[PDB]
């Protein structure tokens, strides 16, 4: 049976999965879970995913509750022989390492900031603290790009799909003007056909955050 993706396109890790789906022409049934209405706490979705998070994928009996597993699963099932999830062990571990950076560091800091806005209101958030934490992530990615065109080497991989959606989201608030490699990489990502899958949810997130946070992003 075809995969079912539970999603809210305001979520960057959702948008990474949407980008992979578009890149690989995957036939997926979409089911919208409105996070800002708390639908991720509805009894049946909670039973499916106790972490009450999107993206969640149901593919037959397999239930995945993390975008990075979903990216790897879909690449392994629908892109055997591709370069997104490379077959050679060392290259694959490098992609995996950067997927985990996205999970552990970049998204953690993005989510910490966005959560603070939703909970406290933008006027009551320590923006300087979060600017420091998120600029530290920019600095790391700029170094990651020193000897490669893409995040994990010379070719586009799953790591780029995972990072670019969160990066585009952090970049709602914090510009890339000071980071030449990161800005060039982001511009190149924006040229890919599959990047169109990021656009609608980024803008919906912008609009939702500004309304819920009572502020305007600088951009």
Ligand X SMILES: N[C@@H](CCC(=O)N[C@@H](CS)C(=O)NCC(=O)O)C(=O)O
Ligand Y SMILES: C[C@]12CC[C@@H]3c4ccc(O)cc4CC[C@H]3[C@@H]1CC[C@@H]2O
Kindly state whether residue 190 participates in binding a second copy, applying the rule CB under 8 A. Answer: no
Our finding on whether 15 is near ligand Y (CB under 6 A) is no
Strand partners, 206: none
| Binding partner selected for residue 54 from ligand X, ligand Y, a second copy, none, CB under the kind-specific 5 to 8 Å limit | ligand X
Draw the binding track, 26-55, toward a second copy (x: CB under 8 A; -: no contact): ------------------------xx----
Distance CA 62, CA 70 (A): 10
As a whole number of angstroms, the distance between CA 22 and CA 34 comes to 22
Closest CB 121 distance from ligand Y, rounded Å: 12
CA distances from 74 to 22, 26, 188, 212 (A): 12, 8, 23, 34
Nearest distance from C-beta of residue 208 to ligand X, angstroms: 12
The single residue among 2, 37, 87, 100 that binds a second copy, judged by CB under 8 A, is: 100
Identify whether the C-beta of residue 94 lies closer than 8 Å to the C-beta of residue 153.
yes
Q: Which residues, in sequence order, are bridge partners of residue 59? A: 62
Regarding 104 and contact with ligand X (CB under 6 A), the answer is yes
**Size (the chain), residues:** 219
**Cis bond leading into 55, ω under 30°?**
yes
- Residues numbered 131 to 190 that lie near ligand X (CB under 6 A) are none
CB closer to ligand Y, 36 vs 217: 36
58 bridge partner residues: 4, 63
Least Å distance between CB 98 and a second copy?
9
Q: What is the DSSP letter of 219?
A: -
Nearer to ligand X, 28 or 154 (CB): 28
Q: Which does 118 bind (CB under 5 to 8 A by kind): a second copy, ligand Y, ligand X, none?
A: ligand Y
């Amino acid at each position: 049976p075809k995969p079912i993706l539970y999603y809210d396109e305001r979520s960057p890790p959702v948008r990474s999965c949407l980008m992979l789906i578009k890149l690989l022409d995957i036939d997926v049934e979409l089911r919208f879970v409105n996070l800002f209405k708390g639908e991720q706490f509805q009894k049946d979705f909670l039973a499916l995913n106790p972490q009450h998070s999107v993206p969640t994928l149901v593919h037959g009996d397999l239930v995945l509750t993390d975008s990075h597993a979903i990216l790897i699963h879909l690449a392994e099932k629908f892109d055997e022989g591709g370069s997104l999830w490379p077959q050679e062990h060392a290259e694959r571990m490098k992609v995996l390492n950067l997927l985990l950076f996205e999970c552990s560091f970049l998204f953690r800091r993005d989510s910490d900031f966005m959560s603070a806005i939703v909970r406290q209101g933008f006027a009551n958030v320590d923006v300087a603290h979060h600017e420091r934490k998120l600029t530290e992530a920019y600095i790391i990615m700029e170094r990651y790009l020193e000897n490669s065109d893409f995040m994990a080497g010379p070719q586009l991989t799953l790591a780029d799909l995972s990072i670019v959606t969160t990066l585009s989201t952090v970049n709602l608030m914090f510009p890339l003007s000071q980071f030449p490699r990161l800005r060039r990489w982001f511009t190149a990502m924006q040229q890919l056909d599959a990047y169109e899958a990021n656009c609608s949810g980024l803008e919906k997130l912008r609009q939702t955050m500004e309304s819920v946070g009572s502020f305007q992003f600088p951009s």
